[PDB]
Amino acid sequence: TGGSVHSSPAIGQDGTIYVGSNDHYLYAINPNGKLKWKFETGGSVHSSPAIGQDGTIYVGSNDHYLYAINPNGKLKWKFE
């Protein structure tokens, strides 16, 4: 990643690994080590992601928001 990986990884139902970085992104990494997608927030993603029953990925950011990200890497919503 572009900065410290302070965030703790979460593992999806299909093995996808999700983790934040101080480079401001939430990363979705395939089990083979190849990027699935990254999603840019406005600040360090120190928070560790959680995965909902429908696969939504939730994570906080130092930009003050809680993010809900769809499994395909598109924003679902953010809460300030």
Place of tokens 């990027």: 35
Strand 50-51 relative to strand 75-79, pairing: unpaired
Number of residues that make up the chain = 80
Residue of 25, 26, 39, 49 that binds its own copies (CB under 8 A): 49
Q: Please give the structure tokens belonging to residue 63.
A: 């930009």
Residue of 37, 55, 68, 70 that binds its own copies (CB under 8 A): 68
Task: Tell me the Cα Rg of the chain.
Answer: 11
- Kindly state the number of chain residues that form the binding site for its own copies, as judged by CB under 8 A: 47
Contacts with its own copies by CB under 8 A lie at 1-11, 15, 17, 19, 21, 23, 27, 29, 31-33, 35, 43, 46-53, 56, 58-66, 68, 76-80
